Amino acid sequence: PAEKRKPIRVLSLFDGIATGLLVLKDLGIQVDRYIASEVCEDSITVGMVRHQGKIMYVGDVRSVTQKHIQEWGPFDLVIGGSPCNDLSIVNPARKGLYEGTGRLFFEFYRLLHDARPKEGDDRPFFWLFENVVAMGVSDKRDISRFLESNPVMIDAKEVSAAHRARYFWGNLPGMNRPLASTVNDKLELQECLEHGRIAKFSKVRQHFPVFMNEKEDILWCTEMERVFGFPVHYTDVSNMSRLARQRLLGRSWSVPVIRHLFAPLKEYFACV
Amino acid sequence: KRKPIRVLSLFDGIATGLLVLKDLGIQVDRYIASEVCEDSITVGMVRHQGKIMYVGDVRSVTQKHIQEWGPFDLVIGGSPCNDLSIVNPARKGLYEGTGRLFFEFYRLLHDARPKEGDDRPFFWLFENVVAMGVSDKRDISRFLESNPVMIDAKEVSAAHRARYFWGNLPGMNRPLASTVNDKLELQECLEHGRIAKFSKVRFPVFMNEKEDILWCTEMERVFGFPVHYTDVSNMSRLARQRLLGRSWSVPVIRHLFAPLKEYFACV
Amino acid sequence: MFETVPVWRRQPVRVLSLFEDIKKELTSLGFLEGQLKHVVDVTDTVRKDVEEWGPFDLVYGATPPLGHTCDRPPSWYLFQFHRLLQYARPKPGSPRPFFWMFVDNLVLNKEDLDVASRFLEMEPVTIPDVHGGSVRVWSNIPAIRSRHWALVSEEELSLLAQNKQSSTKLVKNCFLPLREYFKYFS
Amino acid sequence: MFETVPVWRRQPVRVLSLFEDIKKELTSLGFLEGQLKHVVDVTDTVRKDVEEWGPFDLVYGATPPLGHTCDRPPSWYLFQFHRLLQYARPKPGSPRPFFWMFVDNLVLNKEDLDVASRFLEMEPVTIPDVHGGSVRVWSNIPAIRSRHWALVSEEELSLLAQNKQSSTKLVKNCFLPLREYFKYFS
Numbered sequence: 001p002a003e004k005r006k007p008i009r010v011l012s013l014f015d016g017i018a019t020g021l022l023v024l025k026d027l028g029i030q031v032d033r034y035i036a037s038e039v040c041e042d043s044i045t046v047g048m049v050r051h052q053g054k055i056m057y058v059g060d061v062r063s064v065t066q067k068h069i070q071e072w073g074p075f076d077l078v079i080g081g082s083p084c085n086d087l088s089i090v091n092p093a094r095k096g097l098y099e100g101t102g103r104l105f106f107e108f109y110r111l112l113h114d115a116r117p118k119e120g121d122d123r124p125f126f127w128l129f130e131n132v133v134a135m136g137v138s139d140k141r142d143i144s145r146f147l148e149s150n151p152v153m154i155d156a157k158e159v160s161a162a163h164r165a166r167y168f169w170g171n172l173p174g175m176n177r178p179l180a181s182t183v184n185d186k187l188e189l190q191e192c193l194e195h196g197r198i199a200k201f202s203k204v205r206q207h208f209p210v211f212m213n214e215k216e217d218i219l220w221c222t223e224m225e226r227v228f229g230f231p232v233h234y235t236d237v238s239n240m241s242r243l244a245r246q247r248l249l250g251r252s253w254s255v256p257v258i259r260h261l262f263a264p265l266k267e268y269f270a271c272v
Numbered sequence: 273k274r275k276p277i278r279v280l281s282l283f284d285g286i287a288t289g290l291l292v293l294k295d296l297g298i299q300v301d302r303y304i305a306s307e308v309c310e311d312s313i314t315v316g317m318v319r320h321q322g323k324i325m326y327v328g329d330v331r332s333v334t335q336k337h338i339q340e341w342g343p344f345d346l347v348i349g350g351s352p353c354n355d356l357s358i359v360n361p362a363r364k365g366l367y368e369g370t371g372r373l374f375f376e377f378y379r380l381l382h383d384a385r386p387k388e389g390d391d392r393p394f395f396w397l398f399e400n401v402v403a404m405g406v407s408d409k410r411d412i413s414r415f416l417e418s419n420p421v422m423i424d425a426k427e428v429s430a431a432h433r434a435r436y437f438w439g440n441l442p443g444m445n446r447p448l449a450s451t452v453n454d455k456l457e458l459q460e461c462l463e464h465g466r467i468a469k470f471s472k473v474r475f476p477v478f479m480n481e482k483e484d485i486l487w488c489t490e491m492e493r494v495f496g497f498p499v500h501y502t503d504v505s506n507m508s509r510l511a512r513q514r515l516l517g518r519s520w521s522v523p524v525i526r527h528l529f530a531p532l533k534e535y536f537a538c539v
Numbered sequence: 540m541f542e543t544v545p546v547w548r549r550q551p552v553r554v555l556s557l558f559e560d561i562k563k564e565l566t567s568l569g570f571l572e573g574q575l576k577h578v579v580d581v582t583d584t585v586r587k588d589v590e591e592w593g594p595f596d597l598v599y600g601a602t603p604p605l606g607h608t609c610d611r612p613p614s615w616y617l618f619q620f621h622r623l624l625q626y627a628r629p630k631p632g633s634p635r636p637f638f639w640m641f642v643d644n645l646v647l648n649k650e651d652l653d654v655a656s657r658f659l660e661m662e663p664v665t666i667p668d669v670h671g672g673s674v675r676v677w678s679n680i681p682a683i684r685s686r687h688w689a690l691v692s693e694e695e696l697s698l699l700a701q702n703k704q705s706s707t708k709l710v711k712n713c714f715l716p717l718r719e720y721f722k723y724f725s
Numbered sequence: 726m727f728e729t730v731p732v733w734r735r736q737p738v739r740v741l742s743l744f745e746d747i748k749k750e751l752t753s754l755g756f757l758e759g760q761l762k763h764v765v766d767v768t769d770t771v772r773k774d775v776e777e778w779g780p781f782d783l784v785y786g787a788t789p790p791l792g793h794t795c796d797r798p799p800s801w802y803l804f805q806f807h808r809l810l811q812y813a814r815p816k817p818g819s820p821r822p823f824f825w826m827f828v829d830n831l832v833l834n835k836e837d838l839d840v841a842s843r844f845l846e847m848e849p850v851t852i853p854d855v856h857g858g859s860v861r862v863w864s865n866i867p868a869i870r871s872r873h874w875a876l877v878s879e880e881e882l883s884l885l886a887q888n889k890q891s892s893t894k895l896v897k898n899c900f901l902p903l904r905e906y907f908k909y910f911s
């Protein structure tokens with residue numbers, strides 16, 4: 001007899017550039033399976049190449065069914081970050097939580113429900129869902145009422161050279177505990193630029209963010225990867241445009257924060 | 273005890289010269305490069321963190337500059353090939369257009385090579401497209417006072433780059449050799465999840481049910497450069513492509529420089 | 540597939556109606572004689588609420604009548620419905636028969652329809668009403684799909700609704716198969 | 726600065742002329758009496774050739790006269806001139822006086838001129854010829870720059886050549902300063 005710690009089986013919805021898996025591997029947690037629902041070919045490719053296939057790419061969220069869930073084996077971790085667009089107080093055209101991409105949220109909800117252990121099964125089950133802090137009070141509420149919980153605002157400002165305040169709903173252990181800097185964690189925007197360039201601000205959020213050898217310029221992509229905490233040249237795949245690439249990193253997860261968030265998983269699953 | 277190498281790179285491009293110089297573990301006292309393209313210029317700057325003293329347009333460099341730029345041990349260069357390429361019909365030959373640029377290399381070579389009497393070791397190298405007019409190949413040979421040494425990177429890399437090489441570097445003729453690490457197969461250059469059609473590049477890759485064009489990441493890898501070596505400006509793909517496009521095959525260049533370890537400071 | 544129940548062991552049915560009550564039309568079938576709990580705005584209704592409201596055998600909810608009687612994007616009803624519907628389910632060891640039904644009064648786009656269907660796990664079953672001078676349904680109540688009329692067109696149906704903006708009996712007989720599971724009164 | 730040499734120590738001058746010879750005009754000054762080697766096409770002329778052709782004290786070369794007498798892009802003369810010019814240079818321990826001169830018969834563009842000057846390390850010295858009814862030079866022959874006429878314009882000079890396509894005495898006097906370094910005859 002012996003109840004050994006086993007590898008983690010995860011389900012990432014709106015996976016993006018697989019920050020989830022990236023960080024999971026970072027913490028040294030063995031991953032049995034990483035099933036991602038992504039529809040953007042660009043991000044899909046990134047994940048495909050950076051994690052050498054390991055990611056089983058399902059398709060559009062709303063093409064995943066309860067039948068698929070239990071068939072896709074039981075899941076230990078469910079993470080996701082539905083598109084912020086129609087929830088952003090800044091985007092006037094926003095169609096709120098019920099229309100546009102706003103709806104996509106319930107897709108996460110629906111699937112969360114189809115995966116969480118049914119009453120009786122005490123199996124360990126963790127889940128996490130992110131979204132922009134700057135959203136309508138009603139939406140924040142409804143989301144809270146759907147996921148049956150309140151979020152946890154947390155800004156990557158405290159652990160990275162950028163200002164990313166995002167809401168976090170979930171049952172991961174110690175989500176409220178204060179964050180911590182690491183010996184390795186570029187917090188100064190200067191500590192992100194490449195050689196020969198000087199930073200104006202201490203943290204990005206106020207136009208072109210850096211000056212260079214007598215010229216005023218925009219942030220480079222290597223640097224932006226470095227600003228969210230991605231390895232350098234991490235998004236150097238495909239022949240996508242600077243604009244594309246940007247859009248990638250642009251709307252991703254601050255690696256430092258998911259490390260912070262995931263960190264306490266190390267004690268519940270097999271380790272590499 | 274031998275000393276550090278002092279180099280003068282003309283039409284430096286993306287610092288392939290210095291890259292390989294470092295690869296062979298050769299101490300570099302100074303690396304002065306003449307480059308006009310901003311994209312390439314930045315690449316060198318970032319990649320070698322400033323070490324490269326960037327002069328400007330080659331023909332803005334003068335005899336006064338040369339001996340003032342300290343004496344040089346190595347002079348390397350590869351003047352634009354466009355106006356020499358038999359393929360380009362609009363080509364204006366060796367005497368017009370960019371063709372002319374060659375003489376600039378000649379002029380400077382002359383201004384740097386040790387004067388009769390000085391026995392100091394001096395090495396120089398100059399490259400260019402094999403596919404050029406017989407008269408130009410001649411003239412060039414007659415100006416640099418020597419004959420080229422054709423050598424194709426096909427023998428040491430997943431690509432077909434037949435180029436002429438004029439120079440005094442030791443053992444430029446000896447056959448090349450593959451290394452434990454030297455992607456010769458176009459497939460061994462592609463990124464995970466993509467399949468290669470040919471064995472060597474001259475819609476190259478086969479990707480998950482899709483016919484598509486080589487990736488800059490794999491292309492660097494095709495050319496013998498380190499992955500991500502050209503991921504620097506917010507430089508477009510075409511630009512980034514263009515950079516590599518016109519460079520030297522690192523393997524082919526490690527080869528030629530290799531013997532140079534035996535004369536300077538072994539970093 | 541719900542295993543039928545003998546007559547001497549069928550108790551009164553507990554119904555939870557959302558967005559509209561059937562307290563009347565459900566009595567008309569002899570299902571009532573309260574056993575039915577009605578709720579309008581579920582906004583703040585939490586899980587414990589739906590539980591302390593006593594167990595339920597039938598969960599009903601339907602979109603507002605064509606006219607915009609209330610302000611709240613269509614989907615809302617569906618999503619919210621699915622929410623409480625889940626809070627209302629039984630335990631794993633299925634005690635007795637449990638049924639639910641969501642009805643749409645031609646108010647959901649063809650977009651909102653794919654959501655609704657994909658969310659309730661089944662295509663709806665449209666039942667019309669003709670007269671010459673004068674609704675979609677989702678549910679697991681037996682033989683509700685063999686009563687589908689693959690006749691009425693969408694184009695026409697769209698015309699029906701568009702004309703109602705510029706100016707019961709249906710489902711009442713869907714509850715009959717429930718007579719075979721719960722107590723009939725008088 | 727070439728140090729002037731006393732008369733009884735001035736042997737006949739050895740002249741290397743390229744693209745055109747001055748065997749005649751150079752004699753008219755009493756520099757000749759051969760000591761001058763002429764070559765037209767230097768395409769295949771190697772270094773050894775320029776050496777075994779006996780030492781030279783004067784290297785002369787000039788563009789072909791206005792008309793395209795020969796086919797070969799202008800620059801060619803300059804580049805090729807610079808080539809042999811170097812093969813003819815003396816040794817480090819400068820034995821005697823060494824002079825060279827490259828003349829352009831208004832055939833080099835303003836681009837080809839930047840090259841020419843930048844290649845021969847000095848601006849040219851334009852010397853005209855007026856008559857009413859009817860050349861640029863590079864060289865190190867003393868006081869050749871104090872004889873410059875910063876008058877004649879470029880636009881005019883351009884018109885001079887453009888009109889010659891649709892249809893000696895100059896430099897002859899530049900050799901005089903050489904009389905102070907080499908033997909004079911009759």
Ligand SMILES: Nc1ncnc2c1ncn2[C@@H]1O[C@H](CSCC[C@H](N)C(=O)O)[C@@H](O)[C@H]1O
Nearest residue numbers: 014016017019037039040060061081252253
């Ligand atoms: N219907 C749909 N199904 C699955 N993914 C979708 C979708 N519509 C949009 N998306 C995906 O929504 C993602 C939102 S961005 C979320 C990024 C993520 N947290 C990260 O760290 O990378 C995008 O990557 C987009 O491709």
Ligand SMILES: Nc1ncnc2c1ncn2[C@@H]1O[C@H](CSCC[C@H](N)C(=O)O)[C@@H](O)[C@H]1O
Nearest residue numbers: 283284285286288307308309329330519520
């Ligand atoms: N007038 C000029 N002065 C300096 N560089 C010039 C020039 N005209 C063209 N070039 C430069 O010529 C380079 C020739 S490509 C040579 C490639 C280089 N040896 C490598 O290994 O990458 C180009 O990058 C171009 O910018």
